[PDB]
C-alpha cells in the first residue's frame, strides 16, 4: 500500500479514493491515493490556487486548466515525464507513438512533457453540445420547431406564458443550462447568438470572444430574455443539478447541453412525465449563420508528478496503468459484474447503469462509481455508445452531416515568459468578463453605457498583448 498524495477535483467533487474504480486501481497498482482537497471543497480553481500557497506540493497534481498546469511544469513545480515514460511506461509510450496528434497536446514548447492530458476519444466522437427543445410542448401549443433565434425567442415566450405543462401555473422555465461556474453558464447561453466566451479563430487570426460586438449583442439579448422570464432566473446559481431538477419536475422547455446525456432523459422520464420528448435540433440560425462553436476538444485538463514526489517511477507506473487495456476499460466502464459484463469480449452495461432502479441516468451512475473521473486518462467512445440512446447516436451524425459544428481552437502553448504573461492576462480578463456579464444579464449594470469602459479595462489588463501572444503560437 504506497500512500500517495494527490490534488484532484472534478465537476465540483474532490476525488474520493474509496470509489470502486479507485479501490480497484489501488489493488492493481498498490497506489493508495490521499486527496489534499478536502470533501467540502467544490471550487477547483480556488482550491488549486490555495494548494500552490501551501508549501509542499502533493505527489500528483491534477487540474482542469492545462495552461496553468504546464506553467507549473515550466517553473519546476512539475517534473518532465518523457524519460520516465520511455523507461517505465510502455502503455503511454505506445499511445504517444500511435497518436502523434495527442502527443502534441502533451509536449510543451520546451520539448518536455509536464502532464498527461485527459483525452477525449476525439477521432470517434467529436461533437459535444447540441440544442434541445420540448417537442411535446411544441405540439401541445400548436407551434412549429423554431429555426431562427427570433423564432426561439417567440417560442420561449409561449412556453412561459401559455402553460405548456398544463397545471395552470406560471412555473415554466423556458430555457435553462447546466454549469458549476460562470464560464459554463455563459458557454451555453451566448452560443445561441453566435458569440464566444473564450478565444476563437477567424481566418487565421485568434480573437477574444468577450471583446467582440457579437458578445455585446448576446449579453444584451440575454438580459432582455432574463427580464421576461425566458431564461432561468437561477442560471448563475442553480448548479449542476439544474437539468435533472428542471426536466424531472416538468419545468424546463429547452437547453444547450451535451448530446448523449441530454438525450438520456426521454427514456429516463418516460413514465414520470408521459409524452416527454426533449428533441435535438440544429443550432438556431441568426441571419443565415447556422453554426455552433460547441465541439469536443482533443483533451480536457491533465495531471503531472510534482517536484516533491519521493517516488516518481512508481507514479509514472500509476499513470501508465490507465493506458493498459484493463486500466482504460476500468476508467471508462466501471467494475465488471456491477456496471458491465463482458459479452463476446466487449463490455455491455447492466440494468444498474441502463435502467437504474433509483431513477438515475446512465452517466450519473457511472460517475458515482468513479468512472469518467477526469485525471489524465484516455476516454473510449465505446463507453459512450454503450449507453447513448438511438436518438443520441443519430444526433452525432445529424450535427456532423449538416456541417454545423466549428472545431474548437486548440489550447495553444508558449515559451516560458510568454506563457507566464498570457495566463496572467487571460486570468485577469476572465474575472472582468464574468463580473460584467453577470451584472449586465441580471440588470444591475447597463451594457450600452458600460461596454466601452469594459473594453478599455480588458486592454488595460493586456488584451492586445494576449492577442499577440495568441497569434504567435498559432
Ligand atoms: C472529460 C469529462 O469528464 N468532461 C466533462 C463532460 O463529460 C462528458 O459528458 C458527456 C455527456 O453526454 O454529458 C459525454 C462525454 O462522454 C463525457 O466525457 C461533462 O460532464 S458531465 O455532463 O458528465 O457532468 C461536462 C459537463 O459540463 O463537464 C466536462 O468536464
Ligand atoms: Ca405550468
Numbering used by the authors: 27 to 500
Give the article text.
Crystal structures of ligand-free Smon0123 (N-28/C-5) and ligand (CΔ4S or CΔ6S)-bound Smon0123 (N-18/C-5) were also determined by molecular replacement with CΔ0S-bound Smon0123 (N-18/C-5). Compared with the structure of CΔ0S-bound Smon0123 and that of ligand-free Smon0123, the N- and C-domains of ligand-bound Smon0123 were 47° more closed than those of ligand-free Smon0123. There was no significant difference in the overall structure among Smon0123 proteins in complex with CΔ0S, CΔ4S, and CΔ6S. Unsaturated GAG disaccharides were bound to the cleft of Smon0123 by hydrogen bonds and van der Waals (C-C) contacts. Smon0123 strictly recognized both residues of unsaturated uronate (ΔGlcUA) and amino sugar (GalNAc/GalNAc4S/GalNAc6S). An aromatic residue, Trp284, showed stacking interactions with both ΔGlcUA and GalNAc/GalNAc4S/GalNAc6S. The numbers of hydrogen bonds between Smon0123 and unsaturated chondroitin disaccharides are 9 for CΔ0S (ΔGlcUA, 4; GalNAc, 5), 14 for CΔ4S (ΔGlcUA, 4; GalNAc4S, 10), and 8 for CΔ6S (ΔGlcUA, 4; GalNAc6S, 4). The numbers of C-C contacts between Smon0123 and unsaturated chondroitin disaccharides are 50 for CΔ0S (ΔGlcUA, 27; GalNAc, 23), 48 for CΔ4S (ΔGlcUA, 26; GalNAc4S, 22), and 53 for CΔ6S (ΔGlcUA, 28; GalNAc6S, 25). The sulfate group of each substrate is situated close to the binding site of Smon0123 and directly forms hydrogen bonds with several residues of Smon0123.
A periplasmic solute-binding protein (Smon0123) captures unsaturated GAG disaccharides with the 1,3-glycoside bond and delivers substrates to an ABC transporter localized in the cytoplasmic membrane. Smon0123 is composed of two major domains (N- and C-domains), and each domain has two small subdomains. Each domain included a parallel and an antiparallel β-sheet surrounded by many α-helices and formed the α/β sandwich structure. All the crystal structures of Smon0123 so far determined include metal ion in its molecule, suggesting that the metal ion contributes to protein folding.
